Design a protein around this ligand. Structure first.
Ligand SMILES: Cc1ccc2nc(CSc3nnc(NC(=O)Nc4cccc(C(F)(F)F)c4)s3)cc(=O)n2c1
Length: 290
């Protein structure tokens, strides 16, 4: 009723794209979806079913959260089974894979339609960071706490448009990004979330700090040199991730502003976005000097 509905005959499955424990994702054609295009490509998540409640709850939530830098959700197909969720197709996949595929080792081959060859430049990295921050501003505005913000949960589309999601499936491809106790994204979590199990807007800005670090390391795992327990010890004792090689000091300052140990002392995501956007939009003369 709140959720938009799509007729099963308007979805034509093409092939699989990914697969987790709670579902499979297919590339599909969807007819009569938008006035612009009579036919268009979409990504279809098929539920592996109790789970219908979570499914319907997720659909209601996704419909509410719709915005420029949040993953575009078109609606549901509930006529017969399996229950389908229909999303915008994002051709570059998740931001972590994208970052790794354009690292400091990348050359002409990595070049493409949307992106230059070689490592992503400072200007491109800032544009990615800015888009993610804009998504987190919107969620902060609505008083929603993500709890699992990381580059693996962001998608990258044509023209390097970047959008936040939350893929149940991330627990499968990126299993080593979680500590199993339930699965906790320890490496992305602030001391108050690890110690006291409190998750807030402020724990999300900490996590965004880590996302910024991921971006400027071309998708390396935070604390990759550490086991899960060693990482808990480090975070709880106040160790901070080192400045990435590609990160200018100005941007590392924005990361540190996210990692203030006291939640209330962390900069607001709005301030973080404001600074990163200014930098993303700054002229090459300015950016060449950082
Ligand atoms: C090559 C490739 C591979 C995979 C692929 N996958 C897709 C979408 S898959 C998908 N599944 N479930 C989803 N749900 C979800 O994110 N819910 C959610 C829950 C809470 C909060 C929020 C948030 F973030 F908005 F706040 C979102 S989004 C499109 C595509 O184009 N893909 C392309």
């Amino acid at each position: 009723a709140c959720v938009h509905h799509i007729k099963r005959r308007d979805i034509v499955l093409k092939w699989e794209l990914g697969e987790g424990a709670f579902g499979k994702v297919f590339l599909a054609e969807c007819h009569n979806l938008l006035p612009e295009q009579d036919k268009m490509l979409v990504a279809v998540k098929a539920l592996k079913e109790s789970a219908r409640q979570d499914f319907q709850r997720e659909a209601e939530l996704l419909t509410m959260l719709q915005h420029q830098h949040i993953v575009r959700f078109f609606g549901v197909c509930t006529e017969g089974r399996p229950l389908l969720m229909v999303f915008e197709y994002m051709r570059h996949g998740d931001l972590n894979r994208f970052l790794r595929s354009h690292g400091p080792d990348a050359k002409l081959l990595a070049g493409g339609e949307d992106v230059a060859p070689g490592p992503l430049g400072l200007g491109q990295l800032l544009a990615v960071a800015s888009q993610v921050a804009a998504g987190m501003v919107y969620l902060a505005g609505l008083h929603f706490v993500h709890r699992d913000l990381a580059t693996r949960n962001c998608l990258v589309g044509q023209g390097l448009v970047v959008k936040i999601g939350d893929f149940g499936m991330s627990r499968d491809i990126y299993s080593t990004d979680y500590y199993r106790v339930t699965m906790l994204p320890i490496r992305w979590m602030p001391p108050e979330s690890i110690l006291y199990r409190k998750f807030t807007t402020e724990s999300d800005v900490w996590s965004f700090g880590v996302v910024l670090w991921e971006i400027f390391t071309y998708g390396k795992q935070p604390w990759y040199q550490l086991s899960n327990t060693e990482a808990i010890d480090c975070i709880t004792q106040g160790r901070e991730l080192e400045r990435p090689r590609a990160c200018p000091p100005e941007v590392y300052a924005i990361m540190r502003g996210c990692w203030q140990r006291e939640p209330q002392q962390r900069h607001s995501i709005k301030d973080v976005h404001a600074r990163l956007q200014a930098l993303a939009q700054a002229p090459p003369v300015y950016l060449d000097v950082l």
